[PDB]
Amino acid sequence: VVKEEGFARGADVSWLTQMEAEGLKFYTPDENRQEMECMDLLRDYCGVNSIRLRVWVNPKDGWNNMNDVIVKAKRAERLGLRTMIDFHFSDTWADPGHQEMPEAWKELSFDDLKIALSEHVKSVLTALKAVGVTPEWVQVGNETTPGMMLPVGSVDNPEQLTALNNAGYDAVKAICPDAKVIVHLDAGNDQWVYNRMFDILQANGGKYDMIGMSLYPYWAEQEGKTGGWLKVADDCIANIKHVKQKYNKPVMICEIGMPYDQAEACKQLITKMMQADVEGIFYWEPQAPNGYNDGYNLGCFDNNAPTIALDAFK
Numbered sequence: 001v002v003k004e005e006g007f008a009r010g011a012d013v014s015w016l017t018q019m020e021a022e023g024l025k026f027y028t029p030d031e032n033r034q035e036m037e038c039m040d041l042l043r044d045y046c047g048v049n050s051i052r053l054r055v056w057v058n059p060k061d062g063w064n065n066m067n068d069v070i071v072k073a074k075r076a077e078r079l080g081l082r083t084m085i086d087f088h089f090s091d092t093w094a095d096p097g098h099q100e101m102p103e104a105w106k107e108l109s110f111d112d113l114k115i116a117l118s119e120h121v122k123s124v125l126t127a128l129k130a131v132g133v134t135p136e137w138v139q140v141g142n143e144t145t146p147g148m149m150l151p152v153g154s155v156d157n158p159e160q161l162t163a164l165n166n167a168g169y170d171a172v173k174a175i176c177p178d179a180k181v182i183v184h185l186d187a188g189n190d191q192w193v194y195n196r197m198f199d200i201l202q203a204n205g206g207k208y209d210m211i212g213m214s215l216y217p218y219w220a221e222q223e224g225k226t227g228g229w230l231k232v233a234d235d236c237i238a239n240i241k242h243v244k245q246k247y248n249k250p251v252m253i254c255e256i257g258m259p260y261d262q263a264e265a266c267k268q269l270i271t272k273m274m275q276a277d278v279e280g281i282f283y284w285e286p287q288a289p290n291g292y293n294d295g296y297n298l299g300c301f302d303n304n305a306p307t308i309a310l311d312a313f314k
């Protein structure tokens with residue numbers, strides 16, 4: 001098997017090692033319904049050529065730590081899958097409402113905080129290099145719409161945010177000179193969020209190679225917003241065009257998802273977005289059963305097998 005080039009048809013499968021430990025099984029969606037390892041299933045039946053993995057610094061239960069990430073990245077590599085590493089710079093989930101630095105970093109000087117961030121990035125990438133894995137892409141933060149490691153890396157501290165961003169960028173290039181560094185925000189439909197962040201980076205010499213977006217549009221259907229999920233997708237396509245023009249950087253859809261029970265609409269969304277001016281699309285945790293963790297319903301499996309959603313990728 002060899003890694004594909006070109007458009008990234010991806011999945012984030014960070015939960016996979018925990019699910020395996022908990023005893024979940026995955027099956028082929030054809031008549032034979034063969035039990036199968038999940039990455040191999042995604043590659044062979046869902047057209048996936050790329051895998052994304054989150055990194056948490058000192059997580060209580062160990063999942064998403066460097067050690068776990070190495071396991072999944074080695075498996076991706078062996079199966080001929082390209083890898084994206086997504087640094088949360090937290091001990092737990094990083095998202096627009098929750099950007100908490102690791103507890104161990106909370107009393108460092110700003111100068112030592114930059115060094116700890118840098119050392120975390122380098123140590124993870126160095127360990128990946130040692131086991132034969134060179135990521136194609138790396139995110140410096142995850143959905144950093146308000147900044148990262150708040151309050152210190154808040155957009156309200158543009159100099160400090162930029163300095164943390166650049167420590168990350170520098171650390172990636174140190175170990176992986178050809179890795180594309182992604183700044184990833186949520187709400188790809190929302191130009192204003194992108195303007196604010198990327199104008200901060202412009203104003204302060206922020207380094208990044210690629211703009212990352214999340215697209216989860218089904219809420220607009222459910223809340224009965226005029227235009228439905230299609231309007232949110234069209235607004236995302238407009239925003240993709242806008243950031244390319246204004247900042248001259250390529251765009252990745254780092255996360256996409258629809259309700260597991262919206263197979264047909266999800267297939268159409270992905271088919272639609274595959275013609276947008278992006279370098280790839282990563283389905284977030286496609287294998288997660290409805291209800292997983294806190295009640296997650298935006299997987300694209302049912303009865304432990306892929307729905308037609310990722311038929312877009314085949």
Ligand SMILES: OC[C@H]1O[C@@H](O)[C@H](O)[C@@H](O)[C@H]1O
Pocket residue numbers: 093094095292293294295296
């Ligand atoms: O369980 C799915 C997870 O989705 C994440 O993006 C979020 O940050 C977590 O708090 C949890 O909702």
